[PDB]
């Protein structure tokens, strides 16, 4: 009788209510009349009212118990019988039950070891499956000397606690608040969550991937209303119209309650079983470690035990607090997933059918007003506007209507307090394409003319096929009372000097969301970015942001910046890089249609070489606060790598002109017949116009960054923080290098620029830095003696040197900068702050 067979209690299985459990009554018709009332039954009753109700207990005395004998014994006696206690089945699946079995071991076995192979744990008695990291497994499996043991015991216990407490995403820009990333490996529950990277799979598909079963919902087509004729009475016709609208609300509420009942008995049940699984999985992993520790302690000789101080109750106690911390995280994560499935995968499907019912009722009610217009005596038109006003605003879902359980209310209130759950469209790059990671499943189709890269940047060109079409989910809930935000990053190219008039006057649309000549629009006119609202009547409001085109150095022109647009009752606002720039009042407008197709396309009287870059386009169904936007600005600014002047990633083996944030109109030139950096002044814009001014950027020596050692990750050519590098530059044909002199007696000293040669009195090793904690494209350059040494010589910068005559600025190293870089606010205008400028298509001069 071979084959691995696991005995599973019926108790540990998933309770999933059949579709036949739920009522179909919402499909029946209602007859509406002058005196028709609403039907609600609250499942509550106050206990204090029950305890002090004088009417509850009977005042009437109990009649005598004695009576005539029973002679009619007729009665139905139920009959019971037993059934078998085992049912044998064969399955290909390896889910929760199978994965937990792999984490146990028999009582009599000695010398267990941990493994990441599920199949080996099943085959071999001494192998126990584990879902923690490769490093934990290896450290748990290590055998050591007696003197090192108590150190190893302290370490692996601590490592257990750390591994259990992992509660964050590795990708920091992903829009995910809480996650426990080892859940997939622990149970393989749902759609193969042990295979592949679980955190990655969760970002794409959400809570759905943990469900072992996707239930089939009952969502009935709400029945017709049959309004009564009262040809005599005006009063009763208006009451019938009022009773129709009031009964429409009952049908919304009952539909929501039908969805909540299915949620709790088919989805929230599954997530409960998952929480119980993780509790057991975690306890098995602690039991395995306690068995490994105990076994290895007893291999040592009896005298070696008295050189090793171990407390086994302390170990059990310390692992248990680690489990209890982990269970808190898991309960929060899973509770969040359950509410998420309710709000994204169930509620909207009900709303689809309820809007369809509202539509059929509106047609019915208006025809009823029209049939009775004579008996309404010209009040008719007041009733038609009441009907259209009442059926415009839809009933919002509130779980607290359908339950008084505080655990469920707090789940729901936590969900609504987390701003990431307000995202309704979130365009991101996966597998050479753009997709929606919001969870609402919007359709996205990118045509061939849009260039994409894996840094989430997309390019809209003037070509006809450079287009994206997003089709929004129609079942998300804000027509009249706007409450929504839009955010994205953008890099807008510089004007052409010859064609300044086409630039400054010709407005062109980039993103267009319109239906029946109503919606919203993002457009650009030269150095102005514009947000526009358009209502059903054709009315217009705008708010804009304009950046200065007469600036020595612009922070906006052809450089990546962050835009956020916010809309409520009063205002439409534009924020740039987290700060409020503009504000327009929008009360005058009424009813904007935001459910249209979104078209990403250049449209207008444009130059044929015009283009736009964009990144991280997303839409929120609420008005983002200043904090939310500033937080989002910082999060989307994060990288392991450094950035160049334009905001793109900084690269090895790329030609760069150097810029200094403290001396902005300055540049490095190699001095005539001398090996030092001479500092000149930048040549400004030559001639003509009046509207334009800038300073030349492609000027000074052409630098280039070179990596020190080949023994590293040679996958990409991207410069990261704390990397060791040589700073080189071109001199006619050859490549020269930047050095510092090993003797450095004064505070500031000129730098030695010479060809590539191994000298003995000059250091060449630079460490590239980023001392600024806020977002920036400025980096710093630190000289040391060599890589291993913890002493730091000084930072590269600029100083005004005195040299006698019988003052001039030089490219230097300085000690004074190291005493300033760690001050609280951080000086952006420090002379050690450099930025690298490559030659870019969107800046010509």
């Amino acid at each position: 009788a071979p084959g691995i067979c696991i005995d599973v209690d019926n108790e540990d299985l998933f309770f999933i209510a059949d579709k036949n459990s739920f009522s179909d009554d919402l499909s029946k018709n209602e007859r509406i009349e002058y005196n028709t009332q609403s039907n609600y039954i609250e499942n509550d009753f106050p206990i204090n009212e029950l305890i002090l109700d004088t009417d509850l207990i009977s005042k009437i005395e109990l009649p005598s118990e004695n009576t005539e004998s029973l002679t009619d014994f007729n009665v139905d006696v139920p009959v019971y019988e037993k059934q078998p206690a085992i049912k044998k089945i064969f399955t290909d699946e390896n889910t929760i039950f199978q994965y937990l079995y792999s984490q146990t071991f028999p009582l009599d076995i000695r010398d267990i070891s941990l493994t990441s192979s599920f199949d080996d744990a099943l085959l071999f008695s001494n192998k126990v499956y584990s879902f923690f990291s490769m490093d934990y497994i290896k450290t748990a499996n290590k055998v050591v000397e007696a003197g090192l043991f108590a150190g190893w015991v302290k370490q692996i216990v601590n490592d257990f606690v750390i591994e259990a407490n992992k509660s964050n995403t590795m990708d920091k820009i992903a829009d995910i608040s809480l996650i426990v990333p080892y859940i997939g490996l622990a149970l393989n529950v749902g759609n193969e969550t042990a295979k592949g990277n679980f955190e990655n799979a969760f970002e794409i598909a959400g809570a759905s991937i943990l469900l072992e079963f996707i239930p089939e919902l009952l969502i009935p087509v709400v029945g017709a209303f049959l309004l009564e004729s009262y040809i005599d009475n005006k009063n009763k016709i208006i009451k019938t119209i009022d009773n129709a609208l009031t009964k429409r609300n009952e049908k919304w509420s009952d539909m929501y309650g039908l969805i909540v009942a299915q949620w709790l008995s088919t989805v929230n049940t599954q997530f409960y079983t998952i929480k119980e699984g993780m509790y057991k999985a975690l306890n098995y992993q602690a039991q395995a470690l306690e068995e490994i520790i105990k076994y290895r302690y007893n291999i040592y000789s009896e005298k070696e035990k008295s050189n090793i101080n171990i407390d086994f109750n302390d170990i059990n106690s310390k692992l248990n607090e680690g489990i209890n911390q982990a269970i808190d995280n898991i309960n929060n994560f899973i509770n969040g997933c359950s509410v998420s499935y309710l709000m994204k995968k169930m509620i909207p499907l009900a709303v689809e059918k309820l809007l369809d019912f509202d539509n059929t009722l509106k047609k019915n009610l208006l025809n009823y007003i029209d049939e009775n217009k004579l008996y309404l005596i010209g009040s008719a038109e007041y009733e038609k506007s009441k009907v259209n006003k009442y059926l415009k605003t839809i009933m919002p879902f509130d779980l607290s209507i359908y339950t008084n359980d505080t655990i469920l209310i707090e789940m729901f209130n936590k969900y609504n307090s987390e701003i990431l759950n307000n995202i309704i469209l979130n365009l991101r790059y996966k597998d050479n394409n753009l997709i929606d990671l919001s969870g609402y499943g919007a359709k996205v189709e990118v045509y061939d003319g849009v260039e994409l890269n894996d840094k989430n940047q997309f390019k809209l060109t003037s070509s006809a096929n450079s287009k994206i079409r997003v089709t929004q989910n129609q079942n998300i809930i804000n027509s009249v009372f706007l409450d929504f935000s839009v955010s994205f990053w953008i890099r807008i190219p510089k004007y052409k000097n010859d064609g300044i008039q086409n630039y400054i006057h010709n407005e062109y649309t980039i993103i267009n969301c319109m239906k029946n000549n109503s919606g919203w629009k993002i457009s650009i006119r030269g150095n102005r970015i514009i947000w526009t609202l358009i209502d059903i009547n054709g009315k217009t409001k705008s708010v804009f942001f304009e950046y200065n085109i007469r600036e020595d150095i612009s922070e906006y022109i052809n450089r990546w910046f962050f835009v956020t647009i916010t809309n409520n009752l009063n205002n439409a606002k534009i924020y740039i890089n987290g700060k409020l720039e503009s504000n327009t009042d929008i009360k005058d407008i009424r009813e904007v249609i935001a459910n249209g197709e979104i078209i990403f396309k250049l449209d207008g009287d444009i130059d044929r070489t015009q283009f736009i870059w964009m990144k991280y386009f997303s839409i929120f169904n609420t008005e983002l606060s200043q904090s939310n936007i500033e937080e989002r600005y910082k999060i989307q600014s994060y990288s392991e790598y450094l950035k160049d002047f334009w905001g793109n990633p900084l690269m090895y083996n790329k030609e760069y002109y150097m810029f200094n944030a403290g001396n902005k109109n300055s540049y490095i030139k190699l001095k005539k017949d001398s090996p030092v950096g001479e500092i000149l002044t930048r040549s400004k814009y030559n001639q003509n116009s009046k509207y334009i001014n800038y300073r030349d950027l492609y000027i000074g020596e052409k630098f280039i960054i070179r990596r020190k050692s080949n023994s590293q990750s040679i996958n990409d050519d991207i410069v990261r923080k704390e990397d060791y590098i040589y700073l080189d530059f071109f001199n006619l044909n050859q490549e020269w290098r930047v050095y510092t002199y090993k003797y450095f007696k004064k505070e500031e000293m000129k730098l030695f620029l010479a060809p590539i040669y191994d000298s003995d009195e000059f250091y060449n090793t630079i460490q590239i830095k980023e001392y600024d904690e806020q977002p920036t494209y400025s980096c710093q350059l630190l000289f040391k003696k060599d890589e291993e040494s913890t002493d730091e010589i000084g930072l590269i910068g600029i100083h005004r040197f005195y040299e006698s005559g019988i003052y001039k600025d030089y490219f230097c190293i300085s000690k004074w900068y190291l005493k300033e870089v760690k001050r609280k606010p951080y000086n952006l205008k420090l002379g050690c702050n450099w930025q690298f400028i490559p030659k870019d298509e969107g800046w010509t001069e």
Binding site: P675, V676, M749, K750, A754, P755, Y757, E803
Partner: peptide, 18 residues
């Protein structure tokens, strides 16, 4: 050719003491 490096080095050592 190494003496191109030495002739630059003295010009730096001059520029330093300047």
């Amino acid at each position: 050719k190494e003496d191109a490096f030495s002739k630059l080095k003295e010009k730096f050592m001059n520029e330093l003491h300047k």
